[PDB]
């Protein structure tokens, strides 16, 4: 597993994980564990991180310019 190929695998891993974590936060909102404002702040952050991860993936897997 090359260095770049390894990276790719983790980025992808991070994308899906980020979604899972957001969803989890949703259930915590539903179950009353956390309030709306908390979900919004945390969710936004994780989502922002997700875009960055994905865009990064696109750059790697692009016809390098």
């Amino acid at each position: 597993m090359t260095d770049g190929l390894n990276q790719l695998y983790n980025l992808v891993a991070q994308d899906y994980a980020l979604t899972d974590t957001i969803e989890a936060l949703s259930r915590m909102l539903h179950r009353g564990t956390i309030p709306l404002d908390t979900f919004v702040k945390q969710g936004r952050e994780l989502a922002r991180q997700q875009f960055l991860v994905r865009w990064h993936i696109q750059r790697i897997t692009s016809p390098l310019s």
């Binding site: 090359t2 260095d3 770049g4 190929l5 390894n6 990276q7 790719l8 957001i22 949703s26 909102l29 539903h30 709306l36 979900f39 919004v40 969710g43 936004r44 952050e45 989502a47 922002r48 997700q50 875009f51 960055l52 865009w55 990064h56 750059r59 790697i60 310019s65």
Partner: protein, 111 residues
């Protein structure tokens, strides 16, 4: 295999300081669209109430408009337009589509 030999940076040498700003604003717009959708599913299955849903969505949409009408607005809207044109505009009726379009409301894939 070999096509992916070395690890790549988030921002390589072909990226200017303006692009970075553009990308960051896009990440922020992304977060809002995603949050907007979760807040709605939340409301739909009674996790929050009418007011909560309403206050929240309003706050989000305002910040959203601000991302589309601030620094690097030119570049940002060019990206958004193509992004929206590519969106999966399905499960959303043409009826609802117009309402949203007049309201400046972005497309939020509801699955």
């Amino acid at each position: 295999s070999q096509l992916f030999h070395d690890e790549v940076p988030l921002f390589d040498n072909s990226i200017t300081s303006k692009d970075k700003e553009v990308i960051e604003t896009l990440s922020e717009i992304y977060s809002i669209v995603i949050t907007l959708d979760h807040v709605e599913k939340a409301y739909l299955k009674d996790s929050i109430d009418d007011t909560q849903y309403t206050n929240t969505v309003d706050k989000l949409l305002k910040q959203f408009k601000v991302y589309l009408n601030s620094q690097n607005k030119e570049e940002i809207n060019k990206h958004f337009q193509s992004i929206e044109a590519f969106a999966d505009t399905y499960n959303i009726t043409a009826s609802n589509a117009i309402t949203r379009l007049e309201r400046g409301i972005p497309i939020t894939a509801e699955h």
